[PDB]
Amino acid sequence: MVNPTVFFDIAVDGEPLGRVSFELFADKVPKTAENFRALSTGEKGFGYKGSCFHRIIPGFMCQGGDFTRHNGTGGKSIYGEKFEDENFILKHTGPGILSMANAGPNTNGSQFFICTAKTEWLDGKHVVFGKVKEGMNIVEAMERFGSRNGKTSKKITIADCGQLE
Ligand SMILES: NNC(=O)c1ccccc1
Numbered sequence: 001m002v003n004p005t006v007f008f009d010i011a012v013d014g015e016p017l018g019r020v021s022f023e024l025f026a027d028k029v030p031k032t033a034e035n036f037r038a039l040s041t042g043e044k045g046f047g048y049k050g051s052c053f054h055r056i057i058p059g060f061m062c063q064g065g066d067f068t069r070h071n072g073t074g075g076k077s078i079y080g081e082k083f084e085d086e087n088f089i090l091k092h093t094g095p096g097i098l099s100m101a102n103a104g105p106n107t108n109g110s111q112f113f114i115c116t117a118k119t120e121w122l123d124g125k126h127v128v129f130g131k132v133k134e135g136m137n138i139v140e141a142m143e144r145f146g147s148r149n150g151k152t153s154k155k156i157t158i159a160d161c162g163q164l165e
């Protein structure tokens with residue numbers, strides 16, 4: 001069956017920036033794809049709507065998904081506990097790759113990152129589960145609000161999000 005597509009509507013200090021959409025590789029990493037899909041639709045009662053990208057490092061990645069502590073210390077999966085690395089079949093091949101942030105082996109929650117370059121040193125440590133489909137230019141625009149230590153100069157939020165048909 002067809003890989004799900006998800007959208008994020010991004011804002012910058014509350015002003016709309018644009019829409020980023022993602023293909024989720026449910027064919028390769030179903031548990032991981034399903035956690036991100038469900039957190040994007042908010043169908044379990046919690047998820048990414050209203051959350052922020054808290055750590056953005058230009059030339060590297062944009063990291064988000066901490067909807068409980070807003071700083072990289074929090075977040076939770078849909079499974080009632082952190083979950084295992086599903087596989088490492090897919091690699092960090094370039095800009096647009098969507099991959100799980102974690103605290104080491106088998107500690108996936110809800111935090112994720114969008115690569116803005118090839119980051120092959122993350123292969124085998126972070127589960128790749130999707131890719132930007134449309135709106136890579138919005139991620140490039142977001143990136144410009146990061147910094148060398150990752151602190152953002154403006155608040156970058158997921159004003160809206162959901163699943164696309
Ligand atoms: N907790 N941070 C992470 O899992 C991470 C993810 C991607 C790049 C660098 C760090």
Ligand SMILES: NNC(=O)c1ccccc1
Binds near residue numbers: 101102103104
């Ligand atoms: N899981 N990876 C991390 O927490 C990390 C954070 C900062 C730099 C490199 C790696």
